[PDB]
């Protein structure tokens, strides 16, 4: 039995390529004229990411990337 080649299918299933955000770390904190620090998003109650990591604001939800917590 000589192995058949037979490569045909839906032409390409592309693998997700990383979205590169340039200096996206800066967007989190808001600095006023005095030098004050204003946090624009919400802190996460979970243990591991506690006080060191913030959440995400999506229109209907709040999402932390470490423990994958979700709120409405």
């Amino acid at each position: 039995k000589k192995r058949k080649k037979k490569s045909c299918t839906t032409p390409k299933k592309n693998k997700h390529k990383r979205k590169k955000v340039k200096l996206a770390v800066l967007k989190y904190y808001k600095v006023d004229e005095n030098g004050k620090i204003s946090r624009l998003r919400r802190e996460c109650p979970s243990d591991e990411c506690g006080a060191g990591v913030f959440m995400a604001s999506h229109f209907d939800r709040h999402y932390c990337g470490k423990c994958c917590l979700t709120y409405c």
């Binding site: 200096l23 800066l26 904190y29 600095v31 030098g35 004050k36 620090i37 006080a51 060191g52």
Partner: protein, 123 residues
């Protein structure tokens, strides 16, 4: 203290390299430094981003952290330990670190002499 001020960060970051207490990169620096588990922070002066000064100056201001500033990201890149070396010991490759956060210090009479002296005189 027989040491010069500018050359003595080497022992702090070397022992912080050995005890696995260093955090490099702006996010892993800022975040973990805001966790109040980290004592002091080392920064670079020369930068192409104006907000990059605002972030960590405000952070070091409110969170009761001390601020050191170095010349270029390159020399700090030589301190952090990201420098790859040649066959004969030439520091050929340099990956520059503007943000350095110290969590676990080592026990040293030298670098703590110079840093404590510099920060006793700064206060």
């Amino acid at each position: 203290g027989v040491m010069d001020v500018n050359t003595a960060l080497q022992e702090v970051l070397k022992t912080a390299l050995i005890h696995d207490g260093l955090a490099r990169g702006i996010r892993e620096a800022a975040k973990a430094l805001d966790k109040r588990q980290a004592h002091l922070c080392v920064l670079a002066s020369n930068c192409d981003e104006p907000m990059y000064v605002k972030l960590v100056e405000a952070l070091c201001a409110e969170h009761q952290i001390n601020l050191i500033k170095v010349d270029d990201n390159k020399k700090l890149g030589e301190w952090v330990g990201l420098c790859k070396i040649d066959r004969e010991g030439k520091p050929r490759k340099v990956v520059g670190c503007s943000c350095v956060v110290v969590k676990d210090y080592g026990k040293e009479s030298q670098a703590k002499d110079v840093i404590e002296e510099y920060f006793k005189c700064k206060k």
